[PDB]
Enzyme design. Structure first.
Site, short mmCIF file in Angstrom:
data_model
loop_
_atom_site.label_atom_id
_atom_site.label_comp_id
_atom_site.label_asym_id
_atom_site.label_seq_id
_atom_site.Cartn_x
_atom_site.Cartn_y
_atom_site.Cartn_z
N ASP A 134 -66.66 -48.33 -108.52
CA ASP A 134 -67.11 -47.07 -107.93
C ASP A 134 -65.98 -46.34 -107.23
O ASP A 134 -66.11 -45.91 -106.08
CB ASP A 134 -68.26 -47.32 -106.94
CG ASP A 134 -69.00 -46.04 -106.59
OD1 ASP A 134 -68.93 -45.07 -107.37
OD2 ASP A 134 -69.65 -46.01 -105.52
N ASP B 233 -65.12 -49.30 -99.38
CA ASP B 233 -66.48 -49.29 -99.91
C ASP B 233 -66.61 -50.21 -101.11
O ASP B 233 -66.65 -49.75 -102.25
CB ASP B 233 -66.89 -47.86 -100.28
CG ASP B 233 -68.39 -47.68 -100.34
OD1 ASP B 233 -69.12 -48.53 -99.78
OD2 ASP B 233 -68.84 -46.69 -100.95
C1 LIG Z 1 -65.13 -34.38 -88.58
N1 LIG Z 1 -64.18 -35.52 -88.69
C2 LIG Z 1 -64.60 -36.70 -87.88
C3 LIG Z 1 -63.57 -37.85 -87.96
N2 LIG Z 1 -63.29 -38.20 -89.39
C4 LIG Z 1 -62.41 -39.40 -89.60
C5 LIG Z 1 -63.17 -40.66 -90.06
O1 LIG Z 1 -63.80 -40.42 -91.33
C6 LIG Z 1 -64.35 -41.56 -91.88
C7 LIG Z 1 -65.53 -41.54 -92.63
C8 LIG Z 1 -66.10 -42.74 -93.20
O2 LIG Z 1 -67.29 -42.73 -93.96
C9 LIG Z 1 -67.75 -41.40 -94.42
C10 LIG Z 1 -67.05 -41.18 -95.80
C11 LIG Z 1 -68.06 -40.98 -96.95
O3 LIG Z 1 -69.01 -42.06 -96.89
C12 LIG Z 1 -69.94 -41.90 -95.81
C13 LIG Z 1 -69.31 -41.34 -94.51
C14 LIG Z 1 -65.42 -43.98 -92.98
C15 LIG Z 1 -65.84 -45.26 -93.47
N3 LIG Z 1 -66.96 -45.48 -94.22
C16 LIG Z 1 -67.44 -46.68 -94.69
C17 LIG Z 1 -67.75 -46.80 -96.07
CL1 LIG Z 1 -67.57 -45.49 -97.14
C18 LIG Z 1 -68.24 -48.02 -96.60
C19 LIG Z 1 -68.41 -49.14 -95.77
C20 LIG Z 1 -68.09 -49.03 -94.40
C21 LIG Z 1 -67.62 -47.83 -93.87
O4 LIG Z 1 -67.39 -47.97 -92.55
C22 LIG Z 1 -67.82 -49.32 -92.28
O5 LIG Z 1 -68.20 -50.00 -93.48
N4 LIG Z 1 -65.07 -46.34 -93.17
C23 LIG Z 1 -63.94 -46.29 -92.44
N5 LIG Z 1 -63.53 -45.11 -91.96
C24 LIG Z 1 -64.22 -43.97 -92.21
C25 LIG Z 1 -63.70 -42.78 -91.67
C26 LIG Z 1 -62.83 -37.02 -90.18
C27 LIG Z 1 -63.87 -35.88 -90.11
#
Ligand SMILES: CN1CCN(CCOc2cc(OC3CCOCC3)c3c(Nc4c(Cl)ccc5c4OCO5)ncnc3c2)CC1
Length: 287
Positions: free
Chosen positions: A159, A177
């Site tokens: 994915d 992910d």
């Molecule tokens: C407006 N700003 C706020 C701060 N941001 C920086 C951090 O952005 C992320 C987002 C993540 O997930 C999103 C991306 C698309 O998928 C859903 C929301 C993060 C992430 N996701 C994550 C996923 Cl996809 C799968 C398993 C996980 C995860 O965290 C824990 O276990 N993980 C780590 N950092 C992320 C930072 C910018 C915008």
């Protein structure tokens, strides 16, 4: 009465009690409530929620994904916990999102990984126009480093998409992910599944998959972010992309060099499609 939260791991280390500063095993609030400080909501889907939090343990930042509703049964639980097993199988790599820990409480699964920069998708929609190709090449290379790490271990991500690649500041990036990650040949607690159809390899249409599927997925990932186009979910346009053809619009504004590489990655025949190691071995893709 309530079961206490317990760590979810497959390493075979001891069965151990989750403890933390601010966490009172007496109090009714969950371990996630007491041991962390919710700073913002990173996302939400039918998977549940992702929170940007600060651990009361070490005082640092993480991302915590909690599942939406309690496990529906034993099989439903095994498949959800498998994501932890997958993430543990990846191990330590600078181009892969590192897993800090995981646990379950009340039928809810909590996955705590390192906090990364915005996803490639978020960075792209914020950038407005096509990314600089110097950026794009750096994205292509780090994900290939991540894929080669996975593929050398007999692992397939299945994915790979802009939303799974996170800007590691700067301007590196990490692949995360690992929910759909399979270890080839020993599968599986749960059956294998295709990823996002927008980025799906053609061989998956007839139920075939190998490490080559990721390479194709990364190809369309890079094509999307480098041209600032949006990929079709179906139809001739979708099917053309899986037949060696390019959108007649064509990637204009892309160099010959980057275009020729994508062609290697977008090759319909899996056995002809370039591998990650061979791609990384090119010279246009060294450090
Ligand atoms: C407006 N700003 C706020 C701060 N941001 C920086 C951090 O952005 C992320 C987002 C993540 O997930 C999103 C991306 C698309 O998928 C859903 C929301 C993060 C992430 N996701 C994550 C996923 Cl996809 C799968 C398993 C996980 C995860 O965290 C824990 O276990 N993980 C780590 N950092 C992320 C930072 C910018 C915008």
């Amino acid at each position: 009465h309530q079961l206490q939260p317990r760590r979810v791991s497959f390493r075979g280390e001891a069965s151990e009690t989750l403890q933390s500063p601010g966490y009172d095993p007496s109090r009714p609030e969950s371990f996630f409530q007491q041991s962390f400080q919710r700073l913002s909501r990173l996302g939400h889907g039918s998977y549940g929620e992702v929170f940007k939090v600060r651990s009361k343990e070490d005082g640092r930042l993480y991302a915590v994904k909690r599942s939406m509703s309690p496990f529906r049964g034993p099989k439903d639980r095994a498949r959800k916990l498998a994501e932890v097993g997958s993430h543990e199988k990846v191990g330590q790599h600078p181009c892969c999102v590192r897993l800090e820990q995981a646990w379950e409480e009340g039928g809810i699964l909590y996955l705590q990984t390192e906090l990364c920069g915005p996803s490639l998708q978020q960075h792209c929609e914020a950038w407005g126009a096509s990314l600089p190709e110097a950026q794009v090449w750096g994205y292509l290379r780090d994900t290939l480093l991540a894929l080669a790490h996975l593929h050398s271990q007999g692992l397939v991500h299945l994915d790979v998409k802009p939303a799974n690649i996170f800007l590691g500041p700067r301007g590196r990036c990490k692949l995360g992910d690992f929910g759909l990650l399979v270890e080839l040949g020993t599968a599986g607690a749960g059956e294998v599944q295709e990823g996002d159809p927008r980025y799906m390899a053609p061989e998956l249409l007839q139920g075939s998959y190998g490490t080559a599927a990721d390479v194709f997925s990364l190809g369309l990932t890079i094509l999307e972010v480098a041209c600032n186009m949006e990929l079709p979910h179906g139809g001739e346009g979708w099917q053309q992309l899986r037949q060696g053809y390019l959108p007649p619009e064509f990637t204009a504004g892309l160099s010959s060099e980057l275009r020729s590489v994508l062609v290697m990655m977008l090759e319909p025949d899996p056995k002809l499609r370039a591998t990650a190691e061979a791609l990384l071995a090119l010279p246009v893709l060294r450090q």
